[PDB]
Amino acid sequence: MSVSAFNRRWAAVILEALTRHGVRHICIAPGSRSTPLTLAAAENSAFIHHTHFDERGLGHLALGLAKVSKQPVAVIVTSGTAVANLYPALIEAGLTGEKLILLTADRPPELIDCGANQAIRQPGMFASHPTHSISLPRPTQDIPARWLVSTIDHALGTLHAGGVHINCPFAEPLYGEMDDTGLSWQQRLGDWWQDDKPWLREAPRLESEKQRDWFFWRQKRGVVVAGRMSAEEGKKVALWAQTLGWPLIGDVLSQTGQPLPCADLWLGNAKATSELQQAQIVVQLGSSLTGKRLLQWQASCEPEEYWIVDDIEGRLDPAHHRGRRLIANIADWLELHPAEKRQPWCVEIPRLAEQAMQAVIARRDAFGEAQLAHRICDYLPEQGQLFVGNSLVVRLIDALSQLPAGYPVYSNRGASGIDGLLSTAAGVQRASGKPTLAIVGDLSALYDLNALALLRQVSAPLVLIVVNNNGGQIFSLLPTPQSERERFYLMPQNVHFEHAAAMFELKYHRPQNWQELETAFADAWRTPTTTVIEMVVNDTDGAQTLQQLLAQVSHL
Amino acid sequence: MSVSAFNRRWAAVILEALTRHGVRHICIAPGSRSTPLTLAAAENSAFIHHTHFDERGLGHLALGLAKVSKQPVAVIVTSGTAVANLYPALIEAGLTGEKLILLTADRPPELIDCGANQAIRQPGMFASHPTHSISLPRPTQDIPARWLVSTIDHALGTLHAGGVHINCPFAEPLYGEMDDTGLSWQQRLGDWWQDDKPWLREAPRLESEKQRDWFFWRQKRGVVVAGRMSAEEGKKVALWAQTLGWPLIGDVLSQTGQPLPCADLWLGNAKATSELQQAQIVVQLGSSLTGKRLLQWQASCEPEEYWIVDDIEGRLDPAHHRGRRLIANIADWLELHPAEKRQPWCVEIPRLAEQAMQAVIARRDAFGEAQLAHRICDYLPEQGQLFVGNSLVVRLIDALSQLPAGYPVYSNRGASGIDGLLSTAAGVQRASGKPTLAIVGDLSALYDLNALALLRQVSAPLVLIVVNNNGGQIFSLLPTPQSERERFYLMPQNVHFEHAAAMFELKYHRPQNWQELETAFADAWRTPTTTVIEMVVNDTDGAQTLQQLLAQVSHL
Numbered sequence A, B: 001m002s003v004s005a006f007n008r009r010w011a012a013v014i015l016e017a018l019t020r021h022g023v024r025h026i027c028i029a030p031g032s033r034s035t036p037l038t039l040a041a042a043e044n045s046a047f048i049h050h051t052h053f054d055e056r057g058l059g060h061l062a063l064g065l066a067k068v069s070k071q072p073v074a075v076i077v078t079s080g081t082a083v084a085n086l087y088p089a090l091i092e093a094g095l096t097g098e099k100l101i102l103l104t105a106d107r108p109p110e111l112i113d114c115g116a117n118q119a120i121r122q123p124g125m126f127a128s129h130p131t132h133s134i135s136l137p138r139p140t141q142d143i144p145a146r147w148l149v150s151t152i153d154h155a156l157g158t159l160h161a162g163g164v165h166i167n168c169p170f171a172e173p174l175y176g177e178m179d180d181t182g183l184s185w186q187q188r189l190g191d192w193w194q195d196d197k198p199w200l201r202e203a204p205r206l207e208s209e210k211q212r213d214w215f216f217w218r219q220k221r222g223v224v225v226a227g228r229m230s231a232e233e234g235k236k237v238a239l240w241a242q243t244l245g246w247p248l249i250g251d252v253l254s255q256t257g258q259p260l261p262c263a264d265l266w267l268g269n270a271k272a273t274s275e276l277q278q279a280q281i282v283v284q285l286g287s288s289l290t291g292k293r294l295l296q297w298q299a300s301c302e303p304e305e306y307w308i309v310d311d312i313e314g315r316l317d318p319a320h321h322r323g324r325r326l327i328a329n330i331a332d333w334l335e336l337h338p339a340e341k342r343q344p345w346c347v348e349i350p351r352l353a354e355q356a357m358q359a360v361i362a363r364r365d366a367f368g369e370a371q372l373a374h375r376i377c378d379y380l381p382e383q384g385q386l387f388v389g390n391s392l393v394v395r396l397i398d399a400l401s402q403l404p405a406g407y408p409v410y411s412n413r414g415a416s417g418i419d420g421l422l423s424t425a426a427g428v429q430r431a432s433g434k435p436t437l438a439i440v441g442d443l444s445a446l447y448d449l450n451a452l453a454l455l456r457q458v459s460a461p462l463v464l465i466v467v468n469n470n471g472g473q474i475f476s477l478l479p480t481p482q483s484e485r486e487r488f489y490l491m492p493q494n495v496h497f498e499h500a501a502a503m504f505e506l507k508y509h510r511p512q513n514w515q516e517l518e519t520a521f522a523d524a525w526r527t528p529t530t531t532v533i534e535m536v537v538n539d540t541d542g543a544q545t546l547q548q549l550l551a552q553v554s555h556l
Ligand SMILES: Cc1ncc(C[n+]2csc(CCOP(=O)(O)OP(=O)(O)O)c2C)c(N)n1
Pocket: A390, A391, A392, A393, A415, A416, A417, A418, A419, A440, A441, A442, A443, A444, A445, A469, A471, A472, A473, A474, A475, B030, B031, B032, B055, B078, B080, B081, B082
């Protein structure tokens, strides 16, 4: 009889179903139409609940939680533009694999397209970007509970990667005391309510078969390219490449320890590309390669075969090489395609890489962002993790620093948005409970400024470095036209971040030299709170330093 | 020959075409893939160029510009999540009619679904929310310029209302000197380049016919309901209703002068609803009605016919009455269906409305948000405009204040999002160049916090009042469950806004009484800058005051 009561019973099935698929974290934004979902969530002891007022930040908070935990994370939002704000995080998850389960409250069908407040067309509004889309019907006891749980179980069970849009219409009344409406309906599921498994278990695995001719191919002159992978996978790939005697080109996101560091510089040297021309096979593990020189070499190389191993689906080679696209867990794949010890075939490149790093070290002293990137390994928190932002910082660290093998690195490098980096970092921290270093640019920090609210709650110290070069200086690295560059590309905002930190009662430092930076870090790691460290640098020094180093190494 | 040059020639045709359809403002966010569009725009002297770093805010800036100017406004963003961030403003425009032209740069077809950085599936990504969607092909001289301009002319010419998504793929290279590549291709348009008209003129008008039985219905017992309309339309509707002798229920968005004010209160009285049962016809002009009591009365009433007149398309009656949905400019419609002088038929409601206002007046003294809303008419800038935020503020002004006829009011009440109110207010100000009073809540201000960057550039004084009641106190008005209310609904953030103002070098006041508030107002109207006035109030006083006044008036 009670619509409000049945709404909550319907919602309770949805939420309990998710607990059977490893959902522990749920991120909730405020609203009224979402009440049945939010109250079901609040009442369910399985969840860790996170809240935020900006649904775009909420989506990215969820992204960060999923990124680190490798488990599906749920999101609840009310109807309207609240739903639209989830798009950026959903798109990124589609590219890098995070399992985001978006529970989006909706008006019932009778209030769509009739000028009702906060009512929009929500089914399909994320187009092809969710992996799965469920448009739930108007709640009714005439649809059995077993149908509802089965539909959720199909979506979660068959989810290899990416987001799920579950649209959830509810009619008013939304409020009122619970009565027994829908209880017998729920009880048709019997002791499933006390179970720890799905109602319907549907969990096919997607995996490429082992390559039977690997033992032939591993005897050839190969190159290993390591992109984004897990910290442990990076260590395994490093050992595997060494054993093969193949050069390892390691991305900043790879955690391989980058045995041939500064590839963005030495790949610019003709002696290196000449040697790499001898490669008959390239085996790339992971994807979303960072550096321009690596992307250019990848595009130009012409091995007999190009393989990409990764656990995400679809084509991952933007140069469309003849070869293989192998879907697998990287660690598992390495066990199936083991290395046998063989004499290394590269002679010139190890020397060039050493020389390249020496050239960077020679310029370590200036208090600039290139130097900060080069030295960043000196500031990584012990037993911690690094979250690297987009634009120049990820490129500078990739080109100029040698990050330790197995030290966890996280990022948003699918679509490389600058719109959710602070909120993502917050989720990254909360998921693992580890001390966290996050580094972002000034426009990036402004973009997600209100996520400083989230950083008021971290479980271990988090240092947020904001590199302030007054605008998007990546457009001083790119050959943008000088006449239009400041107004239409760089867009300097001429701000500092001391007042932003103060607004959210976060500790703040603006160090003016290396000694003050070291003192700031020493202060920051002492407590389970977020410290903002603003590094103010001259606009174009970072870009010019990279360019000068590129040129120097190309002449070695 | 030159891809970079032809990209810019292709883009120049797109941008020049827009100028023939009244596009003067263009809002641009930074990026590289957007270069052909952005350089074409920068070079075109027809445009007023606005920039911002947050694409969600950029969209709302454009929304505000369009809202006031009543012309199409263009937006340029780069590929990736930048495009997704335009969704909230596009959705709101779909509902309230703003013509937003979204030029979204894209990767070319050969770089989609292959793991390329910042490349996503963009065609159709806004689903059914744009009025028109154009997915442009990969640029080539083998497609003639006359096709490109004709497609743009079709989209703009036939655009009654709402957004247009124009997806614009460009292949690299994007940079390089202009040469003559594509010049002869452009010149196929001949002296269209020196013309002031579209290439293809396609502009059918959509309008309902004269109602031939209006002379019959205008003699009946009617009620006029006035929703959102232009300031001039509000004055016309007031005079028209007055002439007919029909009671006018005027929304805060109507600018009718609200001759029967506090309708949200007196509609709660059974005597008013009893009198309204006599209405044989209801003529509603405008839509998006604000108040709960009005929405409830509208839903319950049973006149022989219910008419809704508005220049927006589609059903606008969420109660689905028997009647008519008439598409027209409201001022035009009134001229086509003029009033006849007739004796007013309502007797009780004028009594109740006066009594309701006296009840509110009796409680005007406390320094609270209800009192601020009641008194806001006393503080409107001369020759200015009011921008009213969402949640409690719009409801309190609607329920408790009597706004002057023809005094411009602007709002985002289609989807009623709290995600873009500051950036929308900026656009509203820039469009008219008028002194602006903007009022929003604390979560709303946090949501669009970085839009304070935009408010650093206003052409006349803008007073931004932030009502800080520590959370979304609309959920103290709604019957939300007390146990979950704070954590999962109200979400207090426990901040103030002095540091936010300081960050963007905006003047700031936190007045503690009316004298200090009036002093702040006086100072603020003196210069063409934004002043932030933070009104800190006890969390639940506003909601409770509204609840008490409702009860008091219901018992009259
Ligand atoms: C949501 C979004 N909008 C636009 C872009 C394009 N973009 C890439 S880098 C960049 C500049 C970032 O500026 P900042 O954070 O100051 O970093 P810097 O370039 O100075 O290193 C922009 C606007 C993007 N990647 N994501």
